[PDB]
Amino acid sequence: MPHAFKPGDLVFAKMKGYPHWPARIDDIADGAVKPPPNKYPIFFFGTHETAFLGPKDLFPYDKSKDKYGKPNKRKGFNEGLWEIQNNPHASYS
Ligand SMILES: O=C(N[C@H]1CCCNC1)c1ccccc1
């Protein structure tokens, strides 16, 4: 059975106006800006952006990749697909 989301979990993350996007739940570094309540720091592969999202917009990667893990025209998307498959836990700083 599922747990709550935790740092390191791999997802597709849904934002308004964009396709479901390869992403991971990030840690919050000591000294860094915390997310609002009930939100998670989401690191988007490919664009290397962070947004704060709640679970409604977070789809576990394994379950969802057969639907969402196909190439897309959008800037950074296919790079993102490579990262989540090949080195999802790397520093992209
Ligand atoms: O909207 C943002 N991310 C989208 C763009 C496409 C890939 N990731 C989802 C975003 C977040 C924070 C800073 C700037 C932009």
Side-chain angles (χ1 to χ4, degrees), residues 15 18 21 44 47 49-51:
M15 277 190 66
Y18 295 96
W21 201 282
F44 289 85
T47 62
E49 295 156 337
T50 299

PDB file of all heavy atoms in Angstrom, residues 15 18 21 44 47 49-51, ligand 1:
ATOM      1  N   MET A  15       1.085  20.825 -14.094  1.00  0.00           N
ATOM      2  CA  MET A  15       0.829  22.246 -13.980  1.00  0.00           C
ATOM      3  C   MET A  15      -0.055  22.722 -15.129  1.00  0.00           C
ATOM      4  O   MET A  15       0.046  22.191 -16.234  1.00  0.00           O
ATOM      5  CB  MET A  15       2.159  22.993 -13.953  1.00  0.00           C
ATOM      6  CG  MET A  15       2.673  22.951 -12.514  1.00  0.00           C
ATOM      7  SD  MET A  15       4.080  23.988 -12.164  1.00  0.00           S
ATOM      8  CE  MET A  15       3.505  25.672 -12.369  1.00  0.00           C
ATOM      9  N   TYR A  18       0.522  22.864 -19.074  1.00  0.00           N
ATOM     10  CA  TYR A  18       1.651  22.075 -19.527  1.00  0.00           C
ATOM     11  C   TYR A  18       1.290  20.603 -19.470  1.00  0.00           C
ATOM     12  O   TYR A  18       0.523  20.215 -18.613  1.00  0.00           O
ATOM     13  CB  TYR A  18       2.838  22.283 -18.586  1.00  0.00           C
ATOM     14  CG  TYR A  18       3.427  23.684 -18.545  1.00  0.00           C
ATOM     15  CD1 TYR A  18       3.041  24.601 -17.568  1.00  0.00           C
ATOM     16  CD2 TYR A  18       4.391  24.071 -19.465  1.00  0.00           C
ATOM     17  CE1 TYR A  18       3.603  25.868 -17.510  1.00  0.00           C
ATOM     18  CE2 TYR A  18       4.945  25.340 -19.431  1.00  0.00           C
ATOM     19  CZ  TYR A  18       4.557  26.236 -18.447  1.00  0.00           C
ATOM     20  OH  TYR A  18       5.130  27.483 -18.423  1.00  0.00           O
ATOM     21  N   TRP A  21       4.634  16.255 -16.419  1.00  0.00           N
ATOM     22  CA  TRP A  21       6.038  16.544 -16.680  1.00  0.00           C
ATOM     23  C   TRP A  21       6.947  15.692 -15.801  1.00  0.00           C
ATOM     24  O   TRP A  21       6.750  15.656 -14.589  1.00  0.00           O
ATOM     25  CB  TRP A  21       6.330  18.031 -16.453  1.00  0.00           C
ATOM     26  CG  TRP A  21       7.582  18.499 -17.154  1.00  0.00           C
ATOM     27  CD1 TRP A  21       8.884  18.311 -16.784  1.00  0.00           C
ATOM     28  CD2 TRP A  21       7.620  19.281 -18.370  1.00  0.00           C
ATOM     29  NE1 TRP A  21       9.730  18.913 -17.688  1.00  0.00           N
ATOM     30  CE2 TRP A  21       8.979  19.515 -18.671  1.00  0.00           C
ATOM     31  CE3 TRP A  21       6.634  19.819 -19.211  1.00  0.00           C
ATOM     32  CZ2 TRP A  21       9.379  20.254 -19.792  1.00  0.00           C
ATOM     33  CZ3 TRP A  21       7.028  20.573 -20.302  1.00  0.00           C
ATOM     34  CH2 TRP A  21       8.387  20.781 -20.591  1.00  0.00           C
ATOM     35  N   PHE A  44      11.618  19.815 -11.630  1.00  0.00           N
ATOM     36  CA  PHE A  44      11.167  19.379 -12.943  1.00  0.00           C
ATOM     37  C   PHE A  44      12.421  19.038 -13.739  1.00  0.00           C
ATOM     38  O   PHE A  44      13.290  19.902 -13.944  1.00  0.00           O
ATOM     39  CB  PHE A  44      10.349  20.473 -13.665  1.00  0.00           C
ATOM     40  CG  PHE A  44       8.965  20.715 -13.062  1.00  0.00           C
ATOM     41  CD1 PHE A  44       8.787  21.584 -11.985  1.00  0.00           C
ATOM     42  CD2 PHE A  44       7.852  20.023 -13.536  1.00  0.00           C
ATOM     43  CE1 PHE A  44       7.522  21.761 -11.420  1.00  0.00           C
ATOM     44  CE2 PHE A  44       6.590  20.197 -12.969  1.00  0.00           C
ATOM     45  CZ  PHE A  44       6.428  21.067 -11.916  1.00  0.00           C
ATOM     46  N   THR A  47      13.835  21.114 -17.567  1.00  0.00           N
ATOM     47  CA  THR A  47      13.879  22.557 -17.321  1.00  0.00           C
ATOM     48  C   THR A  47      14.670  22.871 -16.052  1.00  0.00           C
ATOM     49  O   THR A  47      15.133  23.986 -15.834  1.00  0.00           O
ATOM     50  CB  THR A  47      12.462  23.135 -17.225  1.00  0.00           C
ATOM     51  OG1 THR A  47      11.787  22.545 -16.113  1.00  0.00           O
ATOM     52  CG2 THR A  47      11.671  23.009 -18.513  1.00  0.00           C
ATOM     53  N   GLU A  49      13.502  23.352 -13.245  1.00  0.00           N
ATOM     54  CA  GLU A  49      12.780  24.307 -12.418  1.00  0.00           C
ATOM     55  C   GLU A  49      12.157  23.622 -11.200  1.00  0.00           C
ATOM     56  O   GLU A  49      12.007  22.390 -11.165  1.00  0.00           O
ATOM     57  CB  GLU A  49      11.637  24.953 -13.185  1.00  0.00           C
ATOM     58  CG  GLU A  49      12.086  25.809 -14.360  1.00  0.00           C
ATOM     59  CD  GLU A  49      10.884  25.818 -15.273  1.00  0.00           C
ATOM     60  OE1 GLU A  49      10.061  24.878 -15.160  1.00  0.00           O
ATOM     61  OE2 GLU A  49      10.762  26.752 -16.077  1.00  0.00           O
ATOM     62  N   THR A  50      11.820  24.452 -10.197  1.00  0.00           N
ATOM     63  CA  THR A  50      11.146  24.004  -8.993  1.00  0.00           C
ATOM     64  C   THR A  50       9.833  24.763  -8.888  1.00  0.00           C
ATOM     65  O   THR A  50       9.784  25.975  -9.113  1.00  0.00           O
ATOM     66  CB  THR A  50      12.006  24.269  -7.763  1.00  0.00           C
ATOM     67  OG1 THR A  50      13.202  23.527  -7.927  1.00  0.00           O
ATOM     68  CG2 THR A  50      11.342  23.820  -6.469  1.00  0.00           C
ATOM     69  N   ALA A  51       8.769  24.041  -8.549  1.00  0.00           N
ATOM     70  CA  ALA A  51       7.508  24.661  -8.182  1.00  0.00           C
ATOM     71  C   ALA A  51       6.979  23.913  -6.970  1.00  0.00           C
ATOM     72  O   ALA A  51       7.505  22.852  -6.616  1.00  0.00           O
ATOM     73  CB  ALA A  51       6.538  24.660  -9.341  1.00  0.00           C
TER      74      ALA A  51
HETATM   75  O1  LIG B   1       6.067  26.809 -14.503  1.00  0.00           O
HETATM   76  C1  LIG B   1       7.150  26.313 -14.203  1.00  0.00           C
HETATM   77  N1  LIG B   1       7.474  25.056 -14.542  1.00  0.00           N
HETATM   78  C2  LIG B   1       6.827  24.363 -15.660  1.00  0.00           C
HETATM   79  C3  LIG B   1       7.534  24.695 -16.969  1.00  0.00           C
HETATM   80  C4  LIG B   1       7.704  23.454 -17.847  1.00  0.00           C
HETATM   81  C5  LIG B   1       8.473  22.375 -17.108  1.00  0.00           C
HETATM   82  N2  LIG B   1       8.218  22.395 -15.696  1.00  0.00           N
HETATM   83  C6  LIG B   1       6.858  22.866 -15.406  1.00  0.00           C
HETATM   84  C7  LIG B   1       8.174  27.109 -13.456  1.00  0.00           C
HETATM   85  C8  LIG B   1       8.399  26.928 -12.094  1.00  0.00           C
HETATM   86  C9  LIG B   1       9.305  27.736 -11.420  1.00  0.00           C
HETATM   87  C10 LIG B   1      10.018  28.710 -12.103  1.00  0.00           C
HETATM   88  C11 LIG B   1       9.807  28.894 -13.450  1.00  0.00           C
HETATM   89  C12 LIG B   1       8.884  28.106 -14.127  1.00  0.00           C
END
